Amino acid sequence: VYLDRKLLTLEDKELGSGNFGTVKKGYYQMKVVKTVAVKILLKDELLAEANVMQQLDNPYIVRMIGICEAESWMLVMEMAELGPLNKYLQQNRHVKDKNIIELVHQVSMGMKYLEESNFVHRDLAARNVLLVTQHYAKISDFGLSKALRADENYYKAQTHGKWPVKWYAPECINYYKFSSKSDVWSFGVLMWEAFSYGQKPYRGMKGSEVTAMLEKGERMGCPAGCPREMYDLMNLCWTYDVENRPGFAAVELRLRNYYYDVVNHHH
Ligand SMILES: CNC(=O)c1nc(C)n2ccc(Nc3nccc(-n4cc(CN(C)C)cn4)n3)cc12
């Protein structure tokens, strides 16, 4: 869990930055050296994220090397060189439809594992997916993540905070209730963003106007070039009723079959 600071080499230029803090590129001496992504600061929220990540073991989840306490608290991760999914698709609009299906199905696989593990992500969005290659996606940013209690299928938040409302299910807004089903809702928004090549959902709308629109039964339209079947799944993830909304096991199966169907059609 705890890493030796002298084994860590940090690069001067910041790889990434945001309201969360900063991301720096580094090297961790393990016989070989390991290229790492280091998240810098709050201490309770960083240790809590590390505690969640330590318990996770999946190919479609960013791996935590460990934590380091120096000048600031550091979350040391395995490097995904291509960065955030939304920023990548924005910079590469020539990425084929099949490649978008491949990447969102990988996210559904990591989320399926996360659901089986009774963990709620609570910040599933394209900005929080990282690319190892153009054909390899991993879920990151576990700072709002909660291990569900043995007796409950949801996490109840005690009062409001800094929340990405455009990704949140109506029950998250109306009852402060976060489940794997509510992560399914965020995933539908994530699908929309990927098929819109990193475009922001609910363009020019306030958080409250988005709540008003969803309550009326209105949903985001089909992105240009997005297949019928993927927009149907998007709308299914956007089922207002938590009970009738599918879980990741069913969302991953629809994506898995659709991907192989596109793969077959290709050759
Ligand atoms: C905000 N900008 C970036 O993160 C970023 N920008 C560029 C150009 N990158 C290149 C590689 C990379 N790798 C990489 N690997 C493993 C983990 C991470 N984490 C990044 C976050 C932060 N979260 C909001 C996304 C959490 N983990 N990041 C990241 C970035």
Structure determined by: X-ray
Cross-sheet strand order for the sheet of 8-17: 8-17, 22-29, 33-40, 73-78, 64-69
Binding positions: 15-23, 39
Contact residues of ligand 1, CB 6 A cut-off: 15-16, 18, 20, 23, 37, 39, 62, 77, 79-81, 83-84, 127-128, 130, 140-141
| Residue 212: other Cβ atoms inside 10 A | 12
The closest residue, in CA terms, to atom 11 on ligand 1 is 83
- The bridge status of strand 155-156 relative to strand 177-178 is antiparallel
CA dihedral of 35, 41, 44, 50, whole degrees rounded to 10: -10
Is residue 124 within 8 A of residue 184, CB to CB? The reply is no
Active-site residue 123, yes or no? yes
Secondary-structure class of domain 80-265 per CATH: mainly alpha
The CATH architecture assigned to 1-79 reads: 2-Layer Sandwich (3.30)
Q: What is the DSSP string of the chain?
A: -BPPGGGEEEEEEEEEE-SS-EEEEEEEE---EEEEEEEE--HHHHHHHHHHHHH---TTBPPEEEEEESSSEEEEEE--TT-BHHHHHHH-TT--HHHHHHHHHHHHHHHHHHHHTTEE-S--SGGGEEEEETTEEEE---TT-EEPPTT-SSEE-SS--S--TTT--HHHHHH-EE-HHHHHHHHHHHHHHHHTTTPPSSTT--HHHHHHHHHHT--PPPPTT--HHHHHHHHHHT-SSTTTSPPHHHHHHHHHHHHHHHHHHH-
- Whole-number Å distance, alpha carbon 66 to ligand 1 midpoint, is 16
Closest CA to 62 of 72, 70, 50, 44: 50
Can you give the length of the chain in residues? 267
Binding positions for ATP: 15-23, 39
- Phi then psi for 94, rounded to 5 degrees? -85, 0
Residue whose structure tokens are 């390899």 = 136
Tell me how far apart the terminal alpha carbons of the chain are, to the nearest angstrom: 46
Round to whole Å and give the CA distance between 75 and 40. 7
This structure's resolution (Å) is 2.2
What number does the ligand 1 atom closest to the CA of 127 have?
25
- Whole-number Å distance, alpha carbon 83 to ligand 1 midpoint, is 5
The residue ranges of every structural domain in the chain are: 1-79, 80-265
- Whole-number Å distance, alpha carbon 240 to ligand 1 midpoint, is 32
- Whole-number Å distance, alpha carbon 80 to ligand 1 midpoint, is 7
What tokens appear for 196 in the block? Answer: 């819109």
Round to whole Å and give the CA distance between 8 and 174. 45
